[PDB]
Ligand binder design. Structure first.
Ligand SMILES: Nc1ncnc2c1ncn2[C@@H]1O[C@H](COP(=O)(O)OP(=O)(O)OP(=O)(O)O)[C@@H](O)[C@H]1O
Ligand SMILES: Nc1ncnc2c1ncn2[C@@H]1O[C@H](COP(=O)(O)OP(=O)(O)O)[C@@H](O)[C@H]1O
Ligand SMILES: Nc1ncnc2c1ncn2[C@@H]1O[C@H](COP(=O)(O)OP(=O)(O)O)[C@@H](O)[C@H]1O
Ligand SMILES: [Mg+2]
Ligand SMILES: [Mg+2]
Lengths: 140, 11, 48, 216, 90, 51, 343
């Protein structure tokens, strides 16, 4: 339905430092390499500020925390929490906006949908009989 | 199943 | 000593491994005998 | 005029001698044995010293460029890093040691039950190596390699000897586990040489057992 | 078991050889590798790490094993490489 | 942290989870050493569910 | 005297050669100003160095190898990018030259795969003339051994474009996030080496639910899908991901610019057995006439990979017998050997 397209644009139209990162890019093996990637993204964006960090397909690393009982769901949860802690945590960052795109919108952890981290939950519904016209007029 | 792995460092 | 080139059988030009330093093609100081340094045996070299 | 040509030769002999003496006193010793990594064209090569440092040489040095080839192990000055002298390989001594001529005679009467396995390798080895004339006319390229996989205790190293012994050949067995040497650039040299030691000798088989040791 | 796992790469195998070599020199030598699990773990590709350093120390021991008798003790045999428990080595 | 007059160290989430084994233990050792030579101190570990 | 002269002149160059010193080979990694760089020795510290006056300021861009002086530490000349077979990527795996004609009985299917793959790489004008972004990706599904890979290999041979082959099932390693990473390195490798047909083998594994490992398959698909229709760079490389099971493949994977064209390649065409044998039989000397037709019914449902063996296995029968194939009696048993013994 065009979610990533708005993001591909904001990048061509932004004076900040767009920093794209797909959700699966954090799931790196070697525990302590995934969570550190989060702490390197918000450090890179903090230095080169103001910046926009766009975590596309966030459904990979931000699924509701069901108590982990194996060393794998535990390391997916260490990523979401490292995500939560830098977005709104003791180290408040200045002018680092985060754009996130997901195709589910309910599987996401309630802490990452709480007005403060992902403030505006824009919805991209299937084009009606009108947006389809505008969509047709620009591709053609 | 899915196994997260640690690692050492041969100097 | 990792090899014995035996350039002419009169100027051997031994190749020596300094362990970590490097591999060098060295020649004996006069004190040693050409026949005493057999291939593969641990050989002592001079720093210079 | 014959005397005049002789005079020119006599002068040339002294200067050839003088240049030779200056080169002779500058050859000296010791040489840092390095490993030519490549040859950029624009007479200059990129030596990667055995001390784990690379040093581009503006002039390849006291050797004929055409002789130097990517991979040659030359002797270079420890300071200038100018190639002094090409160092002969001779396939070391270990490499020729892996040419064991005492194939224990694992005669196919000694390996049992693995017949179709036995005949199959004789199709891709022995036969390809022995009766190659027919192999050339048929167009059936004989596969140079055959991997021996199977649960341990099947005897893969055994039929290997069987094709090793009851088929003649040189059988340079190069079991993979041996090709793990903490000395940088040794097993690789053992590998290229092994085929190099292989080219020198007559129809043979380069047998590497436990390929996992470097097959990882 | 501990000394056969050294920091610097290869120094584990270098010790395995220097032990077996020290045996062939002697007459009637017995080697007793207590707690083989230390350096006898089942192989697995983990090259992204120093573990393969220990594994190549076992493969330098598997080659070595196959007047010198060898003993080994393992309260947990199931963690030993199938290769090292074959009736060609043990 | 705005009114503390006491070194306020901040270890949050997976900052003590290091890939090399025996390094996670080391950092916490050096964290409670930098919190003693600079005492009184307050270590604030956010998202303790992580570690 | 003439012989002495040519050797003596070469010797004189050697006397100059003894004088010449070595340059510490290194790589540049930034350009602080017009006279300052940050060069790194191959196994050495990072020295801040300038460039010799007779050098191109420009040519030295990040990644540009240089060989700085050993005392001044001032760069003295650029060098080509180091080339070694240290590459971990199949990319160097030449497809080898295989003509389209060698694949047999896939005229229509080969024709289609030419369209999507070949066209955007050779005559982009056609696609940009009409204004549609070049199509990218072909999904070749068919029975195993039918020769999906070969057609995907010939397409590389005609275009002379680098081919990377990934056994897709292998990429799904047990440790978490390794599986996504191998796919990521593939497409990242492509950006460096263009253009490359990224031929993914059986793709059912990665594309086509409640377990930690049941979502790692989910993550790997998302990594594969993103790297295709993905922000970064759209690219000019093409993918030929071929499966054996098309029902399994997820819907998104079959889309216009995200892998289109479901080219079916069923077991060797009835007539192909001839052509395939024609293209795979003739090579081996065989003066005797051929009743190919009987071999065709003697070989029903043959995988085609079997047919390649048929002739080759016959050659082994000939390798025993004598040295020249002069009888179809050979293919009959060869057909059996490449059937009951190929079961
Ligand atoms: N077909 C056979 N006939 C007789 N002995 C056999 C046969 N196959 C294996 N063996 C015996 O099995 C033992 C193992 O030797 P070998 O190294 O060949 O086994 P292997 O299966 O190759 O071992 P690995 O696969 O672990 O390297 C030897 O005693 C060998 O003679
Ligand atoms: N409104 C639109 N306008 C233009 N193109 C669109 C629109 N919606 C969808 N598309 C097409 O589909 C793509 C949208 O990407 P999408 O599948 O939504 O990404 P993601 O699932 O990663 O958010 C665009 O690249 C474009 O080709
Ligand atoms: N239909 C065919 N036409 C030509 N060669 C074929 C055919 N089927 C199999 N082969 C042979 O088998 C190999 C290609 O098989 P491959 O493409 O790997 O099969 P698949 O991908 O369907 O499993 C080549 O050696 C090729 O010569
Ligand atoms: Mg998108
Ligand atoms: Mg064996």
């Amino acid at each position: 339905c065009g979610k990533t397209m708005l993001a591909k644009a904001v990048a061509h139209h932004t004076t900040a430092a767009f920093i794209r990162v797909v959700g699966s890019e954090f799931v790196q093996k070697y525990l302590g390499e995934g969570p550190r990637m989060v702490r390197d993204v918000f450090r890179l964006a903090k230095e080169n500020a103001p910046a926009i960090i766009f975590i596309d397909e966030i459904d990979a690393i931000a699924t509701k925390r069901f108590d982990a009982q194996t060393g794998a769901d535990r390391e997916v949860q260490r990523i979401l929490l490292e995500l939560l802690n830098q977005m709104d945590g003791f180290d408040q960052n200045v002018n680092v906006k985060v754009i996130m795109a997901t195709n589910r919108a309910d599987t996401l952890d309630p802490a990452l949908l709480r007005p403060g981290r992902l403030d505006r939950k824009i919805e991209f519904p299937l084009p009606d009989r009108r947006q389809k016209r505008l969509i047709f007029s620009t591709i053609t | 199943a899915x196994x997260x792995x640690x690692x050492x460092x041969x100097x | 000593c990792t090899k014995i080139i035996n350039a002419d059988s009169e100027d051997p030009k031994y190749i020596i491994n300094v362990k970590q330093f490097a591999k060098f093609v060295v020649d004996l100081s006069d004190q040693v005998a050409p026949t005493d340094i057999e291939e593969g045996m641990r050989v002592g070299v001079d720093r210079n | 005029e014959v005397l005049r040509v002789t005079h020119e030769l006599q002068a040339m002999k002294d200067k050839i001698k003088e240049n030779s003496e200056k080169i002779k006193v500058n050859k000296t010793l010791p040489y840092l044995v390095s490993n030519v990594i490549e040859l950029l064209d624009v007479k200059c090569a990129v030596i990667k010293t055995s001390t784990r440092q690379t040093y581009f040489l503006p002039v390849i040095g006291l050797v004929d460029a055409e002789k130097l080839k990517p991979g040659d192990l030359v002797g270079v000055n420890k300071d200038s890093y100018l190639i002094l002298e090409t160092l002969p390989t001779e396939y070391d001594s270990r490499v020729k040691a892996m040419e064991v001529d005492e194939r224990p005679t694992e005669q196919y009467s000694d390996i049992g039950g693995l017949d179709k396995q036995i005949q199959e390798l004789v199709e891709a080895i022995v036969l390809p190596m022995n009766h190659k004339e027919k192999f050339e006319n048929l167009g059936i390229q004989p596969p140079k390699g055959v991997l021996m996989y199977g649960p341990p205790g099947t005897g893969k190293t055994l039929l290997a000897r069987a094709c090793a012994a009851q088929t003649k050949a040189t059988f340079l067995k190069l079991a993979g586990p041996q090709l793990v040497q903490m000395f940088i650039g040794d097993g690789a040299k053992l590998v290229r040489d092994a085929f190099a030691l292989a080219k020198e000798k007559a129809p043979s088989i380069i047998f590497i057992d436990e390929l996992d040791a470097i097959g990882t | 078991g501990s000394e056969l796992v050294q920091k610097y790469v290869g120094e584990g195998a270098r010790m395995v050889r220097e032990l077996f070599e020290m045996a062939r020199t002697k007459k009637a030598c017995l080697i007793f590798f207590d707690e083989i699990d230390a350096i006898g773990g089942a192989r697995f590709d983990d090259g992204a790490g120093g573990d393969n350093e220990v594994q190549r120390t076992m493969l330098e021991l598997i080659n070595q094993l196959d007047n010198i008798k060898v003993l080994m003790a393992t309260n947990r045999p199931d963690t030993l490489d199938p290769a090292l428990m074959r009736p060609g080595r043990l | 942290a705005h009114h503390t007059d006491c070194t306020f160290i901040r270890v949050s989430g997976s900052e003590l989870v290091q890939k090399f084994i025996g390094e996670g233990a080391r950092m916490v050792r050096e964290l409670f050493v930098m919190a003693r030579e600079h005492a009184p101190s307050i270590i604030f570990m956010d998202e303790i569910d992580s570690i | 005297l003439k012989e002495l002269t040519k050797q003596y002149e070469k010797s004189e160059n050697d006397l100059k050669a003894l004088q010449s010193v070595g340059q510490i080979v290194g790589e540049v990694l930034k350009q602080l100003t017009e006279e300052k760089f940050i060069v790194k020795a191959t196994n050495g510290p990072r020295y801040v160095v300038g460039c010799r006056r007779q050098l191109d300021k420009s040519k030295l861009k990040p990644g540009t190898r240089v060989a700085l002086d050993m005392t001044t530490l001032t760069i003295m000349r650029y060098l080509p990018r180091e080339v070694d077979p240290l590459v971990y990527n199949m990319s160097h795996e030449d497809p080898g030259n295989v003509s389209y004609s060698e694949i047999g009985g896939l005229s229509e299917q080969i024709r289609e795969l030419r369209e999507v793959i070949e066209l955007p790489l050779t005559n982009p004008e056609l696609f940009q003339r009409v204004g549609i972004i070049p199509p990218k990706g072909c999904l070749l599904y068919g029975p195993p051994g039918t020769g999906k890979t070969l057609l995907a290999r010939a397409v590389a041979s005609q275009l002379d474009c680098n081919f990377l082959k990934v056994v897709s099932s292998s990429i799904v390693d047990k440790y978490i996030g390794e599986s996504a990473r191998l796919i990521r390195e593939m497409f990242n490798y492509a950006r460096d080496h263009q253009p490359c047909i990224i031929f993914m083998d059986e793709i059912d594994a990665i594309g086509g639910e409640g377990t930690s490992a049941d979502r790692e398959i989910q993550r790997t698909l998302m990594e594969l899908l993103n790297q295709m229709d993905g922000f970064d760079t759209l690219h000019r490389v093409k993918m030929i991901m071929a499966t054996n099971r098309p029902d399994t493949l997820d819907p998104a994977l079959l889309r216009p610019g995200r892998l289109d064209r479901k080219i079916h390649i069923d077991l060797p065409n009835e007539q192909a057995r001839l052509d395939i044998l024609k293209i795979h039989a003739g090579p081996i000397t065989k003066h005797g006439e051929i009743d190919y037709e009987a071999i065709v019914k003697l070989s029903d449902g043959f995988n085609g990979a079997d047919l390649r063996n048929v002739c080759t296995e016959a050659g082994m029968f000939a390798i025993r017998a004598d040295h020249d194939f002069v009888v179809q009696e050979d293919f009959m048993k060869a057909v059996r050997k490449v059937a009951d013994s190929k079961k």
